[PDB]
C-alpha cells in the first residue's frame, strides 16, 4: 500500500531467528520489512515536530529614521552636548568639525558637533530556543495485505514518539500486533542552536552564529536596541549641518547567508506547531507476534479477470489488480517461472498470501521477478492467465 | 630694599654706548644692572596673572549611592531589563549568574540579573582653559638713589605688560627716562593645558593628562555624569543578591599624582584674578636717557652719625645708613681702599652719587669691596668717618 508510490524504497529481509530487526528512516523515504512467513510491514516517517518554543531575541534587519536634531559649539569652550541624547529611542554620534570667522566664532580651530535621531524598526527577525525534552516524532505504518488504494487512508495507522515513551503495542484487526522502538534524539545536530522566524519563512542555525551578526538587537521585553550604530551612517560634517542616512533593508543579504541550513516551517492550520525538514532517525522492530488471516481458506477454482494489466514501477517490481468471479472466499495462487510449464518457482511475492475476501471485490498482488525474461502466472487450471515480461 | 632683600641676586654690566642689555627673570630672582656713567637700576618679576578662564569639565572624585534595585530571570530568556535604566541618574551593571532548584527556578544553567542605583556627587574638581589675550605680566622697577626703607613702597613703580604693549617707558622724576622691552608671547608653549582647582589649591596640567583619567565627568551646566563605572564596584553575585560597593574617595591619590605641576593661587582678594607661581620671562632694557641729579652741589662737610652700622648681606656687598648734621643739600663721597693714605679707591659702588635734600634726611649707601682687607671711608677732610672690613 503506502510505500508503493514513493520516490525511493528499501527492501530488508529478516532470516528466521532474527527476532529483532533494525532499519533507518529518512523524511522522503520508506522501508518494507519482510520475514519468511509473516505478512510484510511498511515503516514510514512523516515529520519531526516541535511545540511552543522559547522566545529569546528580536533582531532588526530594516530601520527608518526621523525627527533629526543637531547642536553646535565653538572651539574655545566646552564640548557638544544635547538633552535628546538621554531618551533611548534615539541613535547618537558626536564629532569635532571645522569652524571659523565665516560663521561667528571668536577664534579659529576645531569645534564640536553632536547629532541624534529617533529610530524605529519595520521588520524584525525573531529567534527562539527549543525544548529538546518536547520534540515529537510522527511515524506511519501499515500491514501490506492486499487492499484497494481507495481505502488506504482508513487502514493506515499513526504513532507518536517522544522522550516519554518507547514502543506502542500497535494493534490490527485479525492480523495481530507489533512493536516499533525509536532512538529518540539522534538528529545530526540539535541544541546549540536557534529556530528563526521571518515573516512566514524560517531557518535553523547554531546559537554561536547569531552573536556575530552586526545587526542591532533587543533582549526580552521592555528593553531597547543596542549596538545600534551599524544600520545608520553619517556623512562628514559641513559647517553646521550633518546629513544622516540609513543602509536600508538588509533582508536579501541575510537570506543569502543561511542557504546551507535545514529548512523549517510553521503551519497554523495544524494548531501552531513547528515542523522540521530534512531530519532522520533509527529504529528497531519485532515482527513475531503477527499472524496470517488467509491460511485456512480454500484454494480458488474459477474464472478470473484483470481489472488492470500489470505495470512497471521504478522499484523494478510489478503490480497488478485482480478480481474473482463467482467463487467462495478463497486464496489465489501466484508463481513466476521461466517456462509456462512452470516446473519451479524462481521468484518471491511481496504479499505472502493473497485473500479473495468475498465476491465482487478487488485484490492487489505485488511480485519481484528475476533478471531476464519470464512469465507471470495467476490463477491455476486451464483458465490460468499469463503476461510476458522483460527484466 | 627689594634688590637687597631677595636672596638670589645676580649682577649685569654693559658697555656705556647705550648698546642693548638683556636678561632672563624668574620669580625667585632679581637682576640689577649697571653701566659706568649712569645710575644703576633693578628690574624684578612680581607675578604672572590670568583673568576669568573658560569652564570646561567638572570631574567628581567622591560619591555616594542612596538606593539599590535588583531584578533577575532564570535560564529561559536571556538578559532581563529594569525600568530605572532609562533614568540617566542611575548606574547599571549586568551579569549572567547561577540558578537552580535551591532558589526555585526550574532548570540548571545560567540565568541573568541586573542591578541599578542612583548617583550623586560629593566634591568636584574643576577644569578651566586659559584665554591667551587675558594674560598679564607685571614687573617691579627701582633706581638705587637710596631712600630710606620706609619709602620703598611709595617710590616703587609697578608696570604691566601684555601682547598689546610690547615695550614701555619708565619715567623717574629728576632722573630722566628708560625703556623696557618684553617678549611676552614667547611661543604657544603656555597653551596645551588646563588650569584646575579643588578648593583654594590649584594646578596647571596638560590636556593629554586630563582627557585620560578614569574618573567620572560631565561638561558644562546641567547634565548627568558619563563613563560612570569607575566609582561603582559590584560584588561577585550570589543567589540573585549583590552588594553594591562605593569605591573609596580618590582625593589623596589624585593630589599625590599631581606633584610635578606648578602651583596656582586663587587669590580672591584681587578681584578673582588668578596668581601663577614659577613664571619665566626674557627682556631688554635701554639705559641711555638716565641722568645724575645734583652732581655739582656742595660737598657735605659737618659731622655725621651711623644709624644702621655697616653690615654684611651675603651677596658680598656691604650696606650702611647715615644721617647728616647740618647744611644744604649736599653730596657725600665714598671710597673703599687699601690704606688710610687713601691713594686709590679700590672697590665698586652700586650707588653712583648719593645726595641728601635736607639735613634731616637719611640715606642708604652700599659697596662691593675688593677681596680681602680694606678700610671703608666716608666724607672728606676733618671729621670723616671710617671703618674696617674683610672680604
Amino acid at each position, epitope marked *: 500500500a503506502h510505500c508503493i508510490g514513493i520516490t525511493d524504497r528499501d527492501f530488508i529481509e529478516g532470516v528466521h531467528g532474527g527476532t529483532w530487526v533494525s532499519a533507518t528512516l529518512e523524511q522522503d523515504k520508506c522501508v518494507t520489512v519482510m520475514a519468511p512467513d509473516k505478512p510484510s510491514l511498511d515503516i514510514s516517517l512523516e515529520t519531526v515536530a516541535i511545540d511552543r518554543p522559547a522566545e529569546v531575541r528580536k533582531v532588526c534587519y530594516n530601520a527608518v529614521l*526621523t*525627527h533629526v*536634531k*543637531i*547642536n*553646535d*559649539k*565653538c572651539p574655545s*569652550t566646552g564640548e557638544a*552636548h*544635547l*538633552a*535628546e541624547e538621554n531618551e533611548g529611542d534615539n541613535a547618537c554620534k558626536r564629532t569635532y568639525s571645522d569652524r571659523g570667522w565665516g*560663521n*561667528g*566664532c*571668536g577664534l579659529f580651530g576645531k*569645534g564640536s558637533i553632536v547629532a541624534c535621531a*529617533k529610530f524605529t524598526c519595520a521588520k524584525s527577525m525573531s529567534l527562539f530556543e527549543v525544548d529538546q525534552t518536547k520534540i515529537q516524532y510522527v511515524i506511519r505504518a501499515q500491514l501490506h495485505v492486499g487492499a484497494k488504494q481507495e481505502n488506504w487512508t482508513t487502514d493506515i495507522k499513526t504513532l507518536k514518539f517522544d522522550a516519554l515513551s518507547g514502543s506502542q503495542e500497535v494493534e490490527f484487526i485479525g492480523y495481530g500486533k507489533a512493536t516499533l522502538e525509536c532512538q529518540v534524539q539522534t538528529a545530526v545536530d540539535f541544541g546549540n542552536s536557534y529556530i528563526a522566524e521571518m515573516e512566514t519563512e524560517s531557518w535553523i542555525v547554531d546559537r554561536q552564529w547569531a552573536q556575530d551578526l552586526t545587526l542591532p538587537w533587543q533582549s526580552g521585553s521592555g528593553g531597547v536596541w543596542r549596538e545600534m550604530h551599524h544600520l545608520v551612517e553619517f556623512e562628514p560634517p559641513h559647517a*553646521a549641518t550633518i546629513r544622516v542616512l540609513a543602509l536600508g533593508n538588509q533582508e536579501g543579504s541575510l537570506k543569502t547567508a543561511l542557504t546551507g541550513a535545514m529548512r523549517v516551517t510553521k503551519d497554523t492550520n495544524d494548531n501552531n506547531l513547528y515542523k522540521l525538514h530534512g531530519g532522520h532517525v533509527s529504529c528497531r522492530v519485532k515482527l513475531s507476534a503477527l499472524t496470517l488471516k488467509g491460511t485456512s481458506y480454500k484454494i480458488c477454482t474459477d474464472k478470473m479477470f484483470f481489472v488492470k494489466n500489470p505495470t512497471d514501477t521504478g522499484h523494478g517490481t510489478v503490480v497488478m489488480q485482480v478480481k474473482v468471479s463467482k467463487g467462495a472466499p478463497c486464496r489465489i495462487p501466484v508463481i513466476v517461472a521461466d517456462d509456462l510449464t512452470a516446473a519451479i518457482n524462481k521468484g518471491i511475492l511481496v504479499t505472502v498470501n493473497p485473500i479473495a475476501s468475498t465476491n465482487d471485490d478487488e485484490v492487489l498482488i505485488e511480485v519481484n521477478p528475476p533478471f531476464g525474461d519470464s512469465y507471470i502466472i495467476v490463477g491455476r487450471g486451464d483458465s490460468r492467465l499469463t503476461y510476458q515480461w522483460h527484466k | 630694599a627689594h634688590c637687597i632683600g631677595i636672596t638670589d641676586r645676580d649682577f649685569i654690566e654693559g658697555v656705556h654706548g647705550g648698546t642693548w642689555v638683556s636678561a632672563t627673570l624668574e620669580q625667585d630672582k632679581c637682576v640689577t644692572v649697571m653701566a659706568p656713567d649712569k645710575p644703576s637700576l633693578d628690574i624684578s618679576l612680581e607675578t604672572v596673572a590670568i583673568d576669568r578662564p573658560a569652564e570646561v569639565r567638572k570631574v567628581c572624585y567622591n560619591a555616594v549611592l542612596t538606593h539599590v534595585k535588583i531584578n533577575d530571570k532564570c535560564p529561559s530568556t536571556g538578559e532581563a531589563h529594569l525600568a530605572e535604566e532609562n533614568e540617566g541618574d542611575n548606574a547599571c551593571k549586568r551579569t549572567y549568574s547561577d540558578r537552580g532548584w535551591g532558589n526555585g527556578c526550574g532548570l540548571f544553567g545560567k540565568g541573568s540579573i541586573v542591578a541599578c542605583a542612583k548617583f550623586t556627587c560629593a566634591k568636584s574638581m574643576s577644569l578651566f582653559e586659559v584665554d591667551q589675550t587675558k594674560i598679564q605680566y607685571v614687573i617691579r622697577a627701582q633706581l638705587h638713589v637710596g631712600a630710606k626703607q620706609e619709602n620703598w613702597t611709595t617710590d616703587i613703580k609697578t608696570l604691566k605688560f601684555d601682547a598689546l604693549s610690547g615695550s614701555q617707558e619708565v619715567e623717574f622724576i629728576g632722573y630722566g627716562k628708560a625703556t623696557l622691552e618684553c617678549q611676552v608671547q614667547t611661543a604657544v608653549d603656555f597653551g596645551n593645558s588646563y588650569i584646575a582647582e579643588m578648593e583654594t589649591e590649584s594646578w596647571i596640567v596638560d590636556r593629554q593628562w586630563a582627557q585620560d583619567l578614569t574618573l567620572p565627568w560631565q561638561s*558644562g*551646566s*546641567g547634565g548627568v555624569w558619563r563613563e560612570m563605572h569607575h566609582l561603582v564596584e559590584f560584588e561577585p553575585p550570589h543567589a540573585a543578591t549583590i552588594r553594591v560597593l562605593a569605591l573609596g574617595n580618590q582625593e589623596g591619590s589624585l593630589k599625590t599624582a599631581l606633584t610635578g605641576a606648578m602651583r596656582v593661587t586663587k587669590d580672591t582678594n584681587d578681584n578673582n584674578l588668578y596668581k601663577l607661581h614659577g613664571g619665566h620671562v626674557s627682556c631688554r632694557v635701554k639705559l641711555s636717557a638716565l641722568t645724575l641729579k645734583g652732581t655739582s652741589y656742595k660737598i657735605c662737610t659737618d659731622k655725621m652719625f651711623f644709624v644702621k652700622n655697616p653690615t654684611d648681606t651675603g651677596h658680598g656687598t656691604v650696606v650702611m645708613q647715615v644721617k647728616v648734621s647740618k647744611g644744604a643739600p649736599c653730596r657725600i663721597p665714598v671710597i673703599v681702599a687699601d690704606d688710610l693714605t687713601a691713594a686709590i679707591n679700590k672697590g665698586i659702588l652700586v650707588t653712583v652719587n648719593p645726595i641728601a635734600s635736607t639735613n634731616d634726611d637719611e640715606v642708604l649707601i652700599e659697596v662691593n669691596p675688593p677681596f680681602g682687607d680694606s678700610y671703608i671711608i666716608v666724607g672728606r677732610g676733618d671729621s670723616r668717618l671710617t671703618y674696617q672690613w674683610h672680604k
Partner: antibody
C-alpha cells in the same frame, strides 16, 4: 527671578532700516539660546529668528536675507538688524530665552516686555 | 512648512466649568508641543513645555495630554484670573510655527 529689557522701537519709512536692541539680567547669559517673535493686529504670531549658543542663526524663508541676528556676550546684549522694511513687518516684537543647553530645539521660557515698530 | 490648527475659534465659558482645546497637526510631531497664555496689557506667559510637563508656579488646574498628531489642553475648573487668550506652539521642525490662537470669555 529673571528679567529682559528691550528697546529701539519707533517709526520707519518703507525701504528703510533699523537696529533693535535687548539686554538681559538675573541669569548667566553665555549658555542660553535666544529668539525673536512678532505679533500683529490680526493677533497671529510668527517666529522671526533664532540663534544658538553657537554663534549661528536660523531664519524662515519669508524674510531670509532681509534681516540678521547676532549676539554680543561681552555685554550680554542682542542685536536685531533689519533692512528694507515693508508694511507687513509693522508689529509688536518680543525677545525670548531658550533652555539649559545650546540648541534652538526647545520650548521657550521667559518673554520680554515688548516694543513696537511701525512702517509708513 | 507644517501647519497646525485648533477647534474652538472663540468660545464662551462659565466659572468652575471644565474646558478643553483640541489641537490637530498635519504630521506626527513626537510631542514637541507647548502651550502659552496671555492676558491683555501684558507679555505672554508659558505654562506647558512638553505634554504634561509644567513650569514652576503653574497652577495645578492646568493639564494636557495626547500623542502623535492630535493633542488636548485641559482645565478642570475655570478661574477668572486665569482666563484670557491661549496659543499652542510646536517646535519639532526647522521652521517653527504657532497655531491659530483661541479666545475665551466668562459669560
Amino acid at each position: 527671578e529673571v528679567k529682559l529689557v528691550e528697546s529701539g522701537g519707533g517709526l520707519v519709512k518703507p525701504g528703510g532700516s533699523l537696529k533693535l536692541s535687548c539686554a538681559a539680567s538675573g541669569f548667566t547669559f553665555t549658555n542660553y539660546a535666544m529668539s525673536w517673535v512678532r505679533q500683529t493686529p490680526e493677533k497671529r504670531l510668527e517666529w522671526v529668528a533664532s540663534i544658538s549658543s553657537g554663534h549661528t542663526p536660523y531664519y524662515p524663508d519669508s524674510v531670509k536675507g532681509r534681516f540678521t541676528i547676532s549676539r554680543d556676550n561681552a555685554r550680554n546684549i542682542l542685536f536685531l538688524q533689519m533692512s528694507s522694511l515693508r508694511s507687513e513687518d509693522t508689529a509688536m516684537y518680543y525677545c525670548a530665552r531658550g533652555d539649559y543647553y545650546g540648541s534652538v530645539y526647545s520650548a521657550m521660557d521667559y518673554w520680554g516686555q515688548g516694543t513696537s515698530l511701525t512702517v509708513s | 512648512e507644517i501647519r497646525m490648527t485648533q477647534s474652538p475659534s472663540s468660545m464662551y465659558a462659565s466659572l468652575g466649568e471644565r474646558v478643553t482645546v483640541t489641537c490637530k497637526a498635519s504630521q506626527d510631531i513626537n510631542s514637541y508641543l507647548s502651550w502659552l497664555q496671555q492676558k491683555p496689557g501684558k507679555s505672554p506667559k508659558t505654562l506647558i513645555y512638553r505634554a504634561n510637563r509644567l513650569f514652576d508656579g503653574v497652577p495645578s488646574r492646568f493639564s494636557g495630554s495626547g500623542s502623535g498628531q492630535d493633542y488636548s489642553l485641559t482645565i478642570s475648573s475655570l478661574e477668572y484670573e486665569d482666563m484670557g487668550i491661549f496659543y499652542c506652539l510646536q517646535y519639532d521642525e526647522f521652521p517653527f510655527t504657532f497655531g491659530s490662537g483661541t479666545k475665551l470669555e466668562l459669560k
